[PDB]
Amino acid sequence: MNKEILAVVEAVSNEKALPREKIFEALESALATATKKKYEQEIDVRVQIDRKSGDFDTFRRWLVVDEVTQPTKEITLEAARYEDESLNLGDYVEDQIESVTFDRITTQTAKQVIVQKVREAERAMVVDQFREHEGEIITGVVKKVNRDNISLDLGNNAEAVILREDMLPRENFRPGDRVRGVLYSVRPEARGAQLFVTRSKPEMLIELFRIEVPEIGEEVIEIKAAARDPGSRAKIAVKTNDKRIDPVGACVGMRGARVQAVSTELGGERIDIVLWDDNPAQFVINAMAPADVASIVVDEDKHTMDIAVEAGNLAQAIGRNGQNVRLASQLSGWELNVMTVDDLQAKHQAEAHAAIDTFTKYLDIDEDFATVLVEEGFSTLEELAYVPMKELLEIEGLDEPTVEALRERAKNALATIAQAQEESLGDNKPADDLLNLEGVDRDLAFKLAARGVCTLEDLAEQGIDDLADIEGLTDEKAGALIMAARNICWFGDEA
Amino acid sequence: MNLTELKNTPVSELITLGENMGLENLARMRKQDIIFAILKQHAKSGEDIFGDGVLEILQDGFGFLRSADSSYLAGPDDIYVSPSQIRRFNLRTGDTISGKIRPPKEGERYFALLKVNEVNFDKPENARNKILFENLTPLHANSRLRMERGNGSTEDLTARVLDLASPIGRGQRGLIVAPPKAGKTMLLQNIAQSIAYNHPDCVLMVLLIDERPEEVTEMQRLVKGEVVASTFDEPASRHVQVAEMVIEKAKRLVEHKKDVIILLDSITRLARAYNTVVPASGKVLTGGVDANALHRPKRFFGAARNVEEGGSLTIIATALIDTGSKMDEVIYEEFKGTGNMELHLSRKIAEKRVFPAIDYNRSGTRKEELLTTQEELQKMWILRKIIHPMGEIDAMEFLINKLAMTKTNDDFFEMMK
DNA sequence: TATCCGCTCACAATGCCACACGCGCTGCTCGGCC
RNA sequence: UUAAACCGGCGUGUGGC
Numbered sequence: 013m014n015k016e017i018l019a020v021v022e023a024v025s026n027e028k029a030l031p032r033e034k035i036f037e038a039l040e041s042a043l044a045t046a047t048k049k050k051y052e053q054e055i056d057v058r059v060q061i062d063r064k065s066g067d068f069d070t071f072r073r074w075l076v077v078d079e080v081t082q083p084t085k086e087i088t089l090e091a092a093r094y095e096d097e098s099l100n101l102g103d104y105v106e107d108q109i110e111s112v113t114f115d116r117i118t119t120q121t122a123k124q125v126i127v128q129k130v131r132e133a134e135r136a137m138v139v140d141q142f143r144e145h146e147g148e149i150i151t152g153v154v155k156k157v158n159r160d161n162i163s164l165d166l167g168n169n170a171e172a173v174i175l176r177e178d179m180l181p182r183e184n185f186r187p188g189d190r191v192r193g194v195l196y197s198v199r200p201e202a203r204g205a206q207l208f209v210t211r212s213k214p215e216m217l218i219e220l221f222r223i224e225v226p227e228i229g230e231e232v233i234e235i236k237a238a239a240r241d242p243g244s245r246a247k248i249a250v251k252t253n254d255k256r257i258d259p260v261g262a263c264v265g266m267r268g269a270r271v272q273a274v275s276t277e278l279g280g281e282r283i284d285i286v287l288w289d290d291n292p293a294q295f296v297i298n299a300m301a302p303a304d305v306a307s308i309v310v311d312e313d314k315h316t317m318d319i320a321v322e323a324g325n326l327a328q329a330i331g332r333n334g335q336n337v338r339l340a341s342q343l344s345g346w347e348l349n350v351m352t353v354d355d356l357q358a359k360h361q362a363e364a365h366a367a368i369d370t371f372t373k374y375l376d377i378d379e380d381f382a383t384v385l386v387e388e389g390f391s392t393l394e395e396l397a398y399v400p401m402k403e404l405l406e407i408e409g410l411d412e413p414t415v416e417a418l419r420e421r422a423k424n425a426l427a428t429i430a431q432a433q434e435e436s437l438g439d440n441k442p443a444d445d446l447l448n449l450e451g452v453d454r455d456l457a458f459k460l461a462a463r464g465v466c467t468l469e470d471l472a473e474q475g476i477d478d479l480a481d482i483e484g485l486t487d488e489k490a491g492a493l494i495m496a497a498r499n500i501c502w503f504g505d506e507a
Numbered sequence: 508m509n510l511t512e513l514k515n516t517p518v519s520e521l522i523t524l525g526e527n528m529g530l531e532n533l534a535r536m537r538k539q540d541i542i543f544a545i546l547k548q549h550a551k552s553g554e555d556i557f558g559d560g561v562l563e564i565l566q567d568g569f570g571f572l573r574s575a576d577s578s579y580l581a582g583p584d585d586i587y588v589s590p591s592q593i594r595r596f597n598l599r600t601g602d603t604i605s606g607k608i609r610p611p612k613e614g615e616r617y618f619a620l621l622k623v624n625e626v627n628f629d630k631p632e633n634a635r636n637k638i639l640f641e642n643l644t645p646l647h648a649n650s651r652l653r654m655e656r657g658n659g660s661t662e663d664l665t666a667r668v669l670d671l672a673s674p675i676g677r678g679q680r681g682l683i684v685a686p687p688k689a690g691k692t693m694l695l696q697n698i699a700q701s702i703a704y705n706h707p708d709c710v711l712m713v714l715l716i717d718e719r720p721e722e723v724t725e726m727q728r729l730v731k732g733e734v735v736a737s738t739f740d741e742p743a744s745r746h747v748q749v750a751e752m753v754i755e756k757a758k759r760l761v762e763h764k765k766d767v768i769i770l771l772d773s774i775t776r777l778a779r780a781y782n783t784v785v786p787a788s789g790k791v792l793t794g795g796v797d798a799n800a801l802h803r804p805k806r807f808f809g810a811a812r813n814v815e816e817g818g819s820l821t822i823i824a825t826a827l828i829d830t831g832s833k834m835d836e837v838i839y840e841e842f843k844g845t846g847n848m849e850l851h852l853s854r855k856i857a858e859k860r861v862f863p864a865i866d867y868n869r870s871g872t873r874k875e876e877l878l879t880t881q882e883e884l885q886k887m888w889i890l891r892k893i894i895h896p897m898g899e900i901d902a903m904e905f906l907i908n909k910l911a912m913t914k915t916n917d918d919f920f921e922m923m924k
Numbered sequence: 925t926a927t928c929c930g931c932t933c934a935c936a937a938t939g940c941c942a943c944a945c946g947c948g949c950t951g952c953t954c955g956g957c958c
Numbered sequence: 959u960u961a962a963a964c965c966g967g968c969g970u971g972u973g974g975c
Contacts, residue, residue, distance in 0.1 A: 161959090186535050188534060188537075566958095567958060568957095569958080571958075581958085589957075590955095590957090591956070593956095
């Protein structure tokens with residue numbers, strides 16, 4: 013009995029993978045799946061065999077929840093006065109006494125459970141390693157290639173998987189080659205593959221440099237950030253502490269040697285090494301290289317950067333798929349816009365001096381006063397609504413009638429915004445065909461349109477439950493009204 | 508063309524060679540399959556092949572030629588030999604058969620040996636004019652084999668220690684008793700390098716049992732001669748397979764009047780492997796062993812003997828103790844009385860970083876007068892007597908000190924006086 | 925060189941159903957391709 | 959690529975219609 017359990021727990025081979033705690037948790041699960049067969053009532057039975065102290069004791073988990081099905085494990089939130097349960101959750105009991113013990117089929121079940129758990133413990137150890145050793149590039153020989161993933165080995169039963177997005181779109185894969193990658197994820201209690209290696213994630217390139225460039229690793233060239241389109245293009249912004257270091261000529265090597273070497277190691281991936289700057293504007297300027305920009309409009313609130321390249325290099329500035337921008341949009345994490353080609357491509361002198369259509373009636377006491385003022389900007393129209401008098405004194409012509417007209421126009425704007433709010437709040441529009449229906453007055457029509465229908469044809473296609481939660485009516489008058497509607501719409505045969 | 512001339516070359520070199528021969532790129536198949544396909548292509552070119560392989564016979568009757576780099580294992584590069592040659596010459600297990608071979612057609616698997624050319628580096632008449640191993644007279648170790656290197660190095664220590672504690676001779680059966688973490692593998696490397704650099708006239712053949720793959724790589728390209736290893740990537744069946752390979756090869760080479768030194772480490776691992784491969788007999792003794800599960804290891808350790816008529820077979824084997832279990836202790840009991848040479852490595856001195864940790868008390872040599880001359884024994888005996896004042900730790904101190912100040916045996920002897 | 929005469933061998937003998945049964949031990953030879 | 963299910967031939971004798 014319990015002595016046999018003690019013998020078999022002291023006789024397990026993988027005591028490092030399956031210590032006594034996990035062994036008796038296995039036995040808990042085995043007794044649970046055994047009691048699943050002992051009684052027709054599918055129940056959970058923790059048994060806490062107390063491996064060190066004694067033998068098993070079948071417990072009946074109250075399994076606190078409002079339902080009743082399988083009532084051996086059904087208790088509501090307060091049925092805890094008896095026996096001193098006194099708890100809304102966690103209170104458990106032992107109703108089953110002298111349950112079935114160790115039939116041969118249950119022995120076979122415990123056997124298969126313990127062998128699959130030895131496997132699962134090997135998996136748990138290798139994934140603890142997977143999680144701790146999240147580090148440098150690792151070599152491995154592949155075993156199987158598929159359309160969605162490939163499988164790799166290192167030796168000593170070190171299985172790993174490289175997913176489709178982790179590979180390259182054109183890197184030919186066949187079972188038997190030594191491929192190198194970077195361990196990236198952590199998955200403690202997975203079911204399929206254990207280790208996860210990638211060759212396409214951005215930081216991979218970082219570590220590439222960290223093992224290639226002799227400068228990085230001693231923290232003289234602090235790599236700032238990087239973005240990557242898998243197997244296509246890797247942009248990377250770096251920052252140096254020393255002043256006599258030239259990362260434009262040191263990180264790449266001698267006429268494209270280090271960058272070219274790490275590109276061949278990547279499997280044919282272009283790389284753009286850029287110098288990181290503490291200014292996001294200058295950073296997004298230099299990141300889109302090779303490209304020149306003379307129109308920089310950076311707004312911090314909406315996270316945008318109007319970075320317009322001069323006309324002519326467009327086909328090279330954006331590139332295929334917008335890579336040179338996308339990676340930039342992934343380097344800083346901002347948004348970029350370029351649409352202008354010839355019509356005032358400055359995008360900063362244009363919008364500042366193109367308002368001849370909206371500023372037609374602003375100082376409409378007499379148009380012969382002065383033109384509009386671009387010193388304040390006159391370009392947001394809403395933060396402009398309330399400005400202090402600390403700058404409302406430089407321009408000439410601000411007589412008292414001017415501020416009186418300002419107040420009148422403020423009243424007009426308040427009235428128009430109130431009208432707009434009334435129009436946008438009344439998404440009901442009760443037409444005459446809705447008020448003319450007998451028994452449906454103005455508030456009833458408002459609510460009927462708030463239900464979701466604003467016409468007459470669809471009204472006849474709703475039940476009593478669709479009119480439930482009615483305010484002003486009740487299910488019998490509901491049925492009366494829906495019958496009148498289906499008569500005037502369907503049973504009337506009129507149009 | 509030949510096997511080893513392609514196998515001592517790396518895998519990338521073989522891939523490039525196969526691609527140079529105009530073939531499907533072989534970087535997808537294993538190195539053994541690479542060489543197999545290269546040989547098949549060379550035979551397709553319109554010529555024969557000249558192969559070499561060590562011989563294996565199963566209950567079937569024909570012969571398998573295993574290669575050197577394969578650690579004497581089953582593979583596509585193993586050559587088939589029709590039983591007709593075995594009926595002709597009675598070629599037992601342990602011939603490096605060198606001869607002409609042809610490619611296999613459909614329905615076959617391996618190359619077939621046409622004719623015999625070389626039988627253990629000897630004329631095929633030696634295949635019919637020789638003496639078996641069970642019939643000769645085993646004797647004691649006559650020849651003396653110096654162990655010290657002769658450069659005054661820091662690992663020379665180990666060698667000279669043994670030289671002034673218990674030397675090694677041709678036909679000896681050495682058993683090293685050592686707990687874990689005592690400096691076993693570098694001791695194997697040191698003694699092998701010394702015996703192969705000081706005495707290239709004698710032939711070396713090292714056996715590795717249940718080591719790490721990095722240990723296999725560090726052993727295989729560092730010591731001279733064949734480096735046979737059998738790690739955990741093979742089951743106990745292939746363990747006993749390579750073991751029986753190497754033992755019958757050594758037996759046949761000794762029959763060919765050759766000096767064969769077999770390093771082995773450890774014995775408990777192969778004993779466990781054998782216990783794994785032999786079925787039970789209804790009863791289990793102490794430690795969990797069987798009745799006949801000791802007959803294989805016994806034979807394996809006792810195949811050592813000194814052949815006074817020509818050639819010799821010496822073995823240097825390490826054992827595992829202090830493992831917490833019983834079976835290792837009973838195995839050490841059984842193998843401590845069967846050897847004709849016993850040495851012990853201490854662990855308490857080893858964990859103090861004072862190496863080597865020889866047990867000068869339990870060290871011994873069976874019939875050492877046949878290994879040591881007149882005044883040679885005089886010097887050794889008086890030094891044993893003066894070290895005899897009960898000492899382990901400061902005894903190791905005295906030994907290591909007087910050994911570090913000095914370069915050769917005679918220097919130590921004539922400076923201590 | 926035709927013309928029977930007779931000797932000698934092939935070929936055949938309902939359809940179903942039901943049940944039962946035994947179709948072996950040991951010496952020798954041969955095969956030579958896991 | 960993934961999930962579920964599955965994995966009387968012969969002869970003889972007897973008796974009957």
